[PDB]
Amino acid sequence: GWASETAALSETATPRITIPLHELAAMPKASQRLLDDSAFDIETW
């Protein structure tokens, strides 16, 4: 505020968002027989 010479200026205006951090889940099912006979890395694909 524009302080006058003899005003005895008073106190002025002093100046939280939460991020819950959710969870994203994937659980693909695969037969054990398949993970042994296929030529492709079904573990990695």
């Binding site: 008073s10 106190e11 205006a13 002093t14």
Partner: protein
């Protein structure tokens, strides 16, 4: 720190008619005039508003104190507060200049406190101590009270009526067991 009240309660707001319905009604004889009964309810309101630090009829107070405790505080002693009227800030002689900004009343039954905005609270001149007028209490009538606090007034004003001097005679929810939950529980006996 004085805390005198502005105006006393009129007596037309006290239930002198509902007290004798507690006192002798249903069981008894359908005894004393209204000036004898009303001298016993306000002698039982002032015994419970002193033990529980309450007000119960919501009259107006004036708290005039000379130094604030913190700069974001000064809890008010009379507990149920609403609508702090003015924050007068007198000087020595006192042309009596009020302030109208800087603080927020926080209505709270635990710590009714005055909590200025930011970090600075209105300071006090040399000799010119600050006064707060506030209107603390439950409601303007008697029907706005908590009923267990209003019952313990009737259980106590019927004690001051039915036995005159300090003579002889504890029930489960007595006088003490009803006002034990309206009392102020503080464990600071320290510096701050």
């Amino acid at each position: 720190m004085m805390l005198n009240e502005v105006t006393a309660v009129p007596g037309t707001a006290l239930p002198v008619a509902e007290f004798r319905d507690h006192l002798r009604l249903g069981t008894g004889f359908a005894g004393a005039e209204d000036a004898a009964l009303l001298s016993y309810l306000r002698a039982a309101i002032a015994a419970i508003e002193g033990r529980t630090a309450k007000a119960l009829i919501s009259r107006g107070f004036r708290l005039a104190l000379t130094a604030w405790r913190w700069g974001d505080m000064q809890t008010l002693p009379i507990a149920p507060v609403a609508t702090v009227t003015a924050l007068r800030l007198v000087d020595a002689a006192g042309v009596e200049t009020p302030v109208a900004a800087g603080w927020r009343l926080v209505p709270d039954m635990a710590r009714p406190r005055i909590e200025a905005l930011g970090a600075m609270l209105p300071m006090i001149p040399t000799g010119g101590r600050v006064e707060i007028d506030f209107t603390a209490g439950f409601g303007a009538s008697w029907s706005a009270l908590p009923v267990d606090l209003a019952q313990a007034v009737f259980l106590l004003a019927a004690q001051y009526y039915e036995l005159r001097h300090d003579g002889a005679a504890a029930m489960p929810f007595g006088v003490m067991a009803l006002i034990e939950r309206w009392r102020t529980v503080r464990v600071l006996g320290g510096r701050p």
